[PDB]
Amino acid sequence: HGSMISEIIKDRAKLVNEKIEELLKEQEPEGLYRAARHYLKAGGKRLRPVITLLSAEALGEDYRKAIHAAIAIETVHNFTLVHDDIMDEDGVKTVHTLFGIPTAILAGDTLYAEAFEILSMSDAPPENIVRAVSKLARVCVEICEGQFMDMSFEERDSVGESEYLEMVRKKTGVLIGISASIPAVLFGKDESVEKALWNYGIYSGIGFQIHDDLLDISGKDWGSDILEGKKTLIVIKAFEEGIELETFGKLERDIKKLFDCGAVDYARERAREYIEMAKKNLEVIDESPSRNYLVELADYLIER
Amino acid sequence: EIIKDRAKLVNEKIEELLKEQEPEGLYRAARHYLKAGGKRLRPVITLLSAEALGEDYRKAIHAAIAIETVHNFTLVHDDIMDEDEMRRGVKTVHTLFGIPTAILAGDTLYAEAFEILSMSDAPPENIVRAVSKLARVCVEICEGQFMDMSFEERDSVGESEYLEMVRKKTGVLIGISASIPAVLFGKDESVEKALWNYGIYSGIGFQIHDDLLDISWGSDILEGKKTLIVIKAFEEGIELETFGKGRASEEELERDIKKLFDCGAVDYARERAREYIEMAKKNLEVIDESPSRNYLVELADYLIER
Numbered sequence: 001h002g003s004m005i006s007e008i009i010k011d012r013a014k015l016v017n018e019k020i021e022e023l024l025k026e027q028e029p030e031g032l033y034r035a036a037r038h039y040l041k042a043g044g045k046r047l048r049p050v051i052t053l054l055s056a057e058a059l060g061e062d063y064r065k066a067i068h069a070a071i072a073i074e075t076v077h078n079f080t081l082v083h084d085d086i087m088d089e090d091g092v093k094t095v096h097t098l099f100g101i102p103t104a105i106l107a108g109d110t111l112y113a114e115a116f117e118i119l120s121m122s123d124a125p126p127e128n129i130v131r132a133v134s135k136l137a138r139v140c141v142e143i144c145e146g147q148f149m150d151m152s153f154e155e156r157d158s159v160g161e162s163e164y165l166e167m168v169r170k171k172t173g174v175l176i177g178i179s180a181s182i183p184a185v186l187f188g189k190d191e192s193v194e195k196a197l198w199n200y201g202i203y204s205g206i207g208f209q210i211h212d213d214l215l216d217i218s219g220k221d222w223g224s225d226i227l228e229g230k231k232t233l234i235v236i237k238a239f240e241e242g243i244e245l246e247t248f249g250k251l252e253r254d255i256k257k258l259f260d261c262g263a264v265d266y267a268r269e270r271a272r273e274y275i276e277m278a279k280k281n282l283e284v285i286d287e288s289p290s291r292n293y294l295v296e297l298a299d300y301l302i303e304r
Numbered sequence: 305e306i307i308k309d310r311a312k313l314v315n316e317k318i319e320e321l322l323k324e325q326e327p328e329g330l331y332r333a334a335r336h337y338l339k340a341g342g343k344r345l346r347p348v349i350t351l352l353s354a355e356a357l358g359e360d361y362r363k364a365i366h367a368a369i370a371i372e373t374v375h376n377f378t379l380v381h382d383d384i385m386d387e388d389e390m391r392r393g394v395k396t397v398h399t400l401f402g403i404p405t406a407i408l409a410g411d412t413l414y415a416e417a418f419e420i421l422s423m424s425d426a427p428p429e430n431i432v433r434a435v436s437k438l439a440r441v442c443v444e445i446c447e448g449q450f451m452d453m454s455f456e457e458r459d460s461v462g463e464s465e466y467l468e469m470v471r472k473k474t475g476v477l478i479g480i481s482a483s484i485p486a487v488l489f490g491k492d493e494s495v496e497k498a499l500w501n502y503g504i505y506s507g508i509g510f511q512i513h514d515d516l517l518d519i520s521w522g523s524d525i526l527e528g529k530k531t532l533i534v535i536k537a538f539e540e541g542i543e544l545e546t547f548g549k550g551r552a553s554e555e556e557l558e559r560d561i562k563k564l565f566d567c568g569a570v571d572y573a574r575e576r577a578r579e580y581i582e583m584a585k586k587n588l589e590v591i592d593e594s595p596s597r598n599y600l601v602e603l604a605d606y607l608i609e610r
Contacts, residue, residue, distance in 0.1 A: 032450040083411060087404035102385040102453055105407060106446045109381060109414065113442035116418050120436040126428035133435050134422040140415030144408045148330040151404060 005296040012053045013046035016074060019067050023118055024075065024111075035099040035107035039078050042092050047301075048179040049074040051204075054297065055197050056183035058290035065123045069132060069182045072119035075111050076136065077175060080143055082108035087151065112140075124186040132185045139174045146170025153231045161236055168209045169202060176208070177201030180294070196284035203281065204298045207274030210267050211302040217258065223251045233270060237263040271302050305602055307348050310361075314347040317369050321420055333401040333409035334416075337376050340394045346481040347372045349506075349603070353499050354485035356596035366424040367434060367484045373417035374438070375477060378445055380410035385453060414442075426488040434487045441476045448473030455530050463535055470511045471504055478510070479503030482600070498590035502600065505587065509580035510607035512573050517610055519570055522557045526550050532576060537569040574608075581608050 020040060026033045049070035056066035085094040086104050096104035119136060122129050149167040153159050180201035184194035213232035216225040225232060227250035235258075238245070243261050245254040258264050275298045285291050318338055324331040347368035354364035383396040384406050390396060398406035421438060424431050451469040455461050482503035486496040515531035518524040524531055528548050537544065546552045546560045564570055584604045591597050 029447055029450050029454065031454065032447060083407050086407060101403075103450065105381050105384060106450050108411075110443055110446040112411070112414055113439040113446070115439075117436055117439035117443070120432050120439065126432045130422050130428045130431045130435075133432075134419050137415040137419035137422065141412055141419070144412045144415070145327055145330060148327045148405065148408050152327065152329070 002292070002296065005293060005300050008054070008293050009045070009047070009050050009297070009300075012050040015053065015067070016046045016049040016070060019071055020074070023068075023071055024114065031099065031103060032106055032110060035082075035095050035103045036110045038092075038095050038098065038107075039081050044074070044078070046074060048077055048176055051176065051201065051294070051297070052179045052182060054290050054293050055180045056187070058285055058288055058294055059183055059187060059189055059193070060286070060288075061183060061187050063183075066183045066186065068118050068120075068122040069186055070179070072115040072136065073175065073179045073182065075115035075118060076140060076143075079108045079111035079115065080147070080175075082111065084147060087147075122186055125188065128186045128188055132182050135178055135182065135185055139178045142170040142174045146172070146174075154229075156231075158239075159231050159236060161233065161240065164231060164233060164236055165206060168206050172209045173202035173205035175201075176205035180204075193284060196281045199281040200278045200294065200298070203274045203278035204301055207271040207278065207298070208301040210271035210274070211304075214264065214267055214271070217255055217264065223247070223255055226251060226254055233267040234258055234263050237261075237266045275299065275302050305606075306599060307603070310348045310351045311344045313351070313365070314344045314368055314372065315341070317365050318372065321366075321369050322373070322416065329401070329405060330408055330412060333397050333405045334380075334412045336394070336397050336400065336409070337379055337391070340392070342372075342376070344372060346375055346478055349478065349481040349503065349600070350484060352596050352599050352603070353482040354489070356591050356594050356600060357485050357489060357491055357495070358592070358594070359485060359489045361485075363425045364485045364488060366420050366422075367488055368481075370417040370421035370438065371477065371481050371484065373413050373420060374442060374445075377410045377413040377417065378449070378477075380406055380413065382449065385449070424488055427490060430488050430490055434484055437483065437487060438480055441480045444472040444476050456528065458530075460538060461530060461535065463532065463539075466530065466532065466535055467508065470508050474511050475504040475507030478507035482506075494590060498587055501587040502584040502604070505580045505584035506604045506607055509577040509584070509604070512577035512580070513608050513610060516570065516573050516577070519561060519564060520610075522552075522561065525560055525564075526552050526557065531573070533564055533567075533569045533573045536572045537564055537567040540567055540569065542567050542569070577608055581605065 024037060024040060026037050052066050052070035052073060053063040056063035082095045082104055086096045086101055095107055116133060119132060120129060122132065146167055150171050153167065177198045178201065180197035181194045184197050210233050213225060213234060217223060226245065227247050229248040238258050238261055241261055243257050245257060247254050278298045279295050282291055282294055322335060322338055324335050350364050350368035350371060351361045354361035379391065380397050383391055384398045384403055388396050389399050397409055418435060421435055422431060448469050452473050455466065455469065479500045480503065482499035483496055486499050512532050515524060515533060519533065525547055526549060534544065534547065542563055544560050544563065546556045581604045585601050588597060588600055
């Protein structure tokens, strides 16, 4: 076909959730685990584990073997969400709001260890598990560096485009990068193939972020990110050519200036560039239904 | 004893594997305690346990650094929770750098530990098991810290609940310190459980003694920390005048400390702490006699002597 991508995401997400329920059961101490399972139970697009399972399939493997890696990465993601929410302080209600900050910190730390425990249950050669552990951990370190950078940007008045893109790469790209590349690691695929899936993830993630930030201008309210002063690629290119907007303390006038300077279309062109780059990296992989799903998925990430 | 030797090795590997890096903000925070220089107890237990198994304990160094990294991770997040302004002789991480950076710093140490563990020179099969066991250990420390903090607001907790909390909060990380060389080098379940049980019991006793060292001042009771002493005494219905206050008079706290010695409760702690360290030794017997094996013995002793 070529138009079922929302249905494949759905199908694989449904698998992800079924195994989430199997592997991340609520336990004692009940207060820790209710915080620990909160975000997971409120749902999630499950985009990263879905990518893992599509990548696994596109590599000619039984993608059920990739479930653990898939859920570990979704577990890492959920963990970052809990801790991140502690630091934006701003639904559903955040975990630190419902359970307090200590329970929230320990809830993230719990999910964090479980991620690795789950990944280690993978049905794959130990040498590859050890490499997947090493690689996921390095990604975790990078996400913290990305989160740190992103917060630094809140205190800065002059964030460069490349700095910002570097931030997004760690904050959003690398986790998506390893959800595409981890079945390569687990199943002994070689370096050029892992590299192709990694780049696919990173470039999808970066573009996915740019488009996400475009949706703030193209439930929640128009121009939210503007009044909250968030540095997006759009904002950064407008500043880059001295547009300087009359909100940033929490409007429709500002939004016109962003289109008028082409900063909105710069960001679109940047996000599409990233997704084309992500798709060209897939060329290394054998054509298959699953490879085309990954291709259409990159498209979806920026066309929704 | 001969620990400053391995303590020396561990800090050399720490400075080799846990470099500062960019963003310097994040790593200045993440290396703050490591540079402050803890006693490195658990790493030394890992190197000695390895040599007691008659292995090349240098091969166990990555697991030694990894467990110390976990330990430092917990310190950072714990200090956020207790809102301590200082830990031993240095300001806490959240106070110098802020709560969000403190969170990210421990989150970074946390991942760094699994990356270091995975570098081990051992059968990969056994690195996987080591990652699985250390990650469950980390889940339990979190379960413990949540238990310990839940205790604060409870009116009374039994010795059992409290001792299950100490087993998770500070014991299992000490158990896996000794356990992990048995895991890494394919010793069998008897040996693992033996080094495991030694590490846990050493932990609990080590904890009970660390609560005694505050009676050895005063802060545990003003802070309301529920120790094994105050659980015995309160089980003995000992009216304790200054347990909640935080601010207190010297005479008021002295009469509360005075009570506690005379309760038949400070004795209980030393005694109960001692029957744990002994349970560690009598467990450690499954391992062959060795300079290393007796070193773990004398070391389980040092946890009760301070």
